[PDB]
Design a protein around this nucleic acid. Sequence first.
DNA 1: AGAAACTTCTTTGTGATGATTGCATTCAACTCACAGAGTTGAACATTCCTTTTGATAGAGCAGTTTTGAAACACTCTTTTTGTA
DNA 2: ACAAAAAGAGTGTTTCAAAACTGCTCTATCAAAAGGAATGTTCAACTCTGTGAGTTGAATGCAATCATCACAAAGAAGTTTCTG
Lengths: 80, 78, 103, 98, 92, 92, 21, 99, 94
Amino acid sequence: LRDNIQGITKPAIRRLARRGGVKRISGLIYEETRGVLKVFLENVIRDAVTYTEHAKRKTVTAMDVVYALKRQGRTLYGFG
Amino acid sequence: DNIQGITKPAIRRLARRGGVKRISGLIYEETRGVLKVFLENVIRDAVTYTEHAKRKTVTAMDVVYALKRQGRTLYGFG
Amino acid sequence: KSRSSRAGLQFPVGRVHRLLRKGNYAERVGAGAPVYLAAVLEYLTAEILELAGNAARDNKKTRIIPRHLQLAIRNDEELNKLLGRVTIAQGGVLPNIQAVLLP
Amino acid sequence: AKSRSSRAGLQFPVGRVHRLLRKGNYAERVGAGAPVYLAAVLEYLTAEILELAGNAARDNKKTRIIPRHLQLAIRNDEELNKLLGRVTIAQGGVLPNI
Amino acid sequence: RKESYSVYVYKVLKQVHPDTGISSKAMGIMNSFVNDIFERIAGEASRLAHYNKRSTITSREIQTAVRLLLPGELAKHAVSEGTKAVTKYTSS
Amino acid sequence: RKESYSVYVYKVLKQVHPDTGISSKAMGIMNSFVNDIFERIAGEASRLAHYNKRSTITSREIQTAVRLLLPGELAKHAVSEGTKAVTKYTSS
Amino acid sequence: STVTKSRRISRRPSDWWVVKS
Amino acid sequence: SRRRQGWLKEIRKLQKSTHLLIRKLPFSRLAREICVKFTRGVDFNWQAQALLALQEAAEAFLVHLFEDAYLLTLHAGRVTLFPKDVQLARRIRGLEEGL
Amino acid sequence: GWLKEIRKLQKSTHLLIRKLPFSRLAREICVKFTRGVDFNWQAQALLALQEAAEAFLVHLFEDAYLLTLHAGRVTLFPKDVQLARRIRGLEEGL
DNA sequence: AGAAACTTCTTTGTGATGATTGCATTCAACTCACAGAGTTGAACATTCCTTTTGATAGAGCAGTTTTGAAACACTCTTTTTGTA
DNA sequence: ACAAAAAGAGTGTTTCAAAACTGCTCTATCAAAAGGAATGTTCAACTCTGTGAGTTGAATGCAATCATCACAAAGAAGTTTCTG
């Protein structure tokens, strides 16, 4: 709580928004975006480790992440 | 005039079931266009299924399969 | 001596086994897989039917109809998320009006 | 001494596509022309993507195709973009908008 | 000649609401639902077996598929029911 | 040992752009793309055969699946290419 | 709230688009 | 006044009924017109259930789209649904969900 | 200034969040999701997870901005982000 | 699935360091309320026309059954292709 | 030169196409009928614009700090083979 979610800094979130094309950003957007990123990661990581422990492994492989995303409807290409 | 078959009061009833209070006047042409676009996508796949079977009638299951492949599962007609 | 009775289920374990074998899912099907799957399916239908029966009772009716199925599904967040991209024929919508409407 | 790919006039492995079809348990039985048709389609789609990617590398004044060029090629063709609508190209970036 | 889960859905309905009936359209919807969920779970279990280079769909794939498909609280009770059933079944 | 489509992607790249190289990561993306499209088409053909109570995936299912999955002109040209290939293949 | 035969609280889908704190 | 809340009665009544809101014959005429526009040769027949399922799906789609577009309406501080609202709702839903 | 920043960012492709903070966040989420058994993470797994998260966030910001413009503003608000998630519809927006 | 041998890839730790973040101001650039001007969509009364419903052929086509010829699975061989 | 996958032949099986047949259900028609859609008007209710008041985010410039890069070592975990 002290950190690890504050590691997603305001300049990073601002860079993300600028690449998205946002010209001007409010101040509550940072906490909103940290929350959105957290809920996104919780969904993917849960499925990834589900795959990883269905295989009797202890290392989360890139393919586990790829399968988690694919089952959630987002196909990732650069890691096959 | 089959697209004009969708009448202003029918579109209004659709919007009211959707919960809309006030409806612009151009919404009617917009909705006719949107409905036509939706129908073109489903009917294309439905007749594709119907042609793959060696049939000449379109079936409830053909429509259901078209909708499922487009990501809209329909339950009442299986 | 049926597998469904042996497992304590109302759903057909043998039929599920045959469907698994004939559905091109894998070359071989374990013995407990149809049991597990039938149990899961029975539990899910029990949940849905319970909520739908409650919805029908709250409408002073004794027959479940697609409207009651829709009301049961769209009012449980778990089932609403499971059946997110599902359309129920003759189900209508939830009676939801925006707050800025009602004066 | 003639490969089925050569007989079809393709660069994609008809034998490998056939083996994948047979082992993926898609059906209990696979026709003879199915892997031919499928490899032809895969090769055509690969060609269509690689052509636009090479054009993007060209007018981008580069010489080697990188993920950025694949992304630019895909998001600039409407049909390819509709096909790969839910696909994320790693290290692909976005398209310049306002 | 056309198999349907109507009799089993009706048994479950009698268990859960012993004096409620179900319309024919509602029964058709229940049949569509069961088929849909069956197909989802079986397809996911198939994909799992294929990922792990296995050729058998066991009760372990069904459990993992249930964990992937169903939202959290649903999945908890689903795997409870499933493990309970397989224990009661192997105990005979 | 490990199968891929890197050699064939490189061949078709030499055909279409005989003077342009491809990055190692772009080649991985192309492999992912080929696998993705193969899986889509094969699964659609599988469920087509299952719908029509057939037990074999013929070149006719591949054609219909291509018609279902690709947008308009993409599908037109893909069907043309596939039919041309199977004709040239049987004419031997 | 609302509990089924199993100890599964079937909460209604109130709101999910808003982040929590 | 003329009618205090005439629209509100209509909304509250429609949101508890389940019947289709478009007429069967106009809908089927439109659907068959589109179908023949797709088939160069001889038209297909249509099961009554096929046309019924098509209409159910289409109406559910349109109702959900109106619900989504009215949120953009209220977002802009209005109460009148504009075509730009529907267009934006389609654009945000994406290529699949928004055609 | 913001204009040249946007134009510079929209032609680049590198990741915008720092790898080590992202890794710490992902790992603590994983340990919250664990069942008493810790996991390791391939270096490629975290890169894959971060490539997807950033693409998701960029696309979400694009959608949210369209809502800001619809409302007649040029400043992005949390209500514009929340509404874009609601319209995307419980799987694409989540 | 389990056991044994091998390897390889993740974790942990150290040190520099310079790029990046954080903190404080401010004020120009934005958001917000609102009052008036201008526009328009809901309500309403009347007509009539289009949809609905019930037959009614009637026939075209879907569904079932059989035969069988083609085509595919299986298996052993040869051979060509990607390492050595 | 050698192993591994893929062509090649031949045989057995099986399965999908063709033909015939039956009935069922889709289409086209019709005939009222009446209920809902179309039309026109209006004005209350809405949207748009412009202004001014109130707020706040980007730009700026510094110090602090920590992400990264490299490097090494260890050993935990993943991989391969084999057997019953």
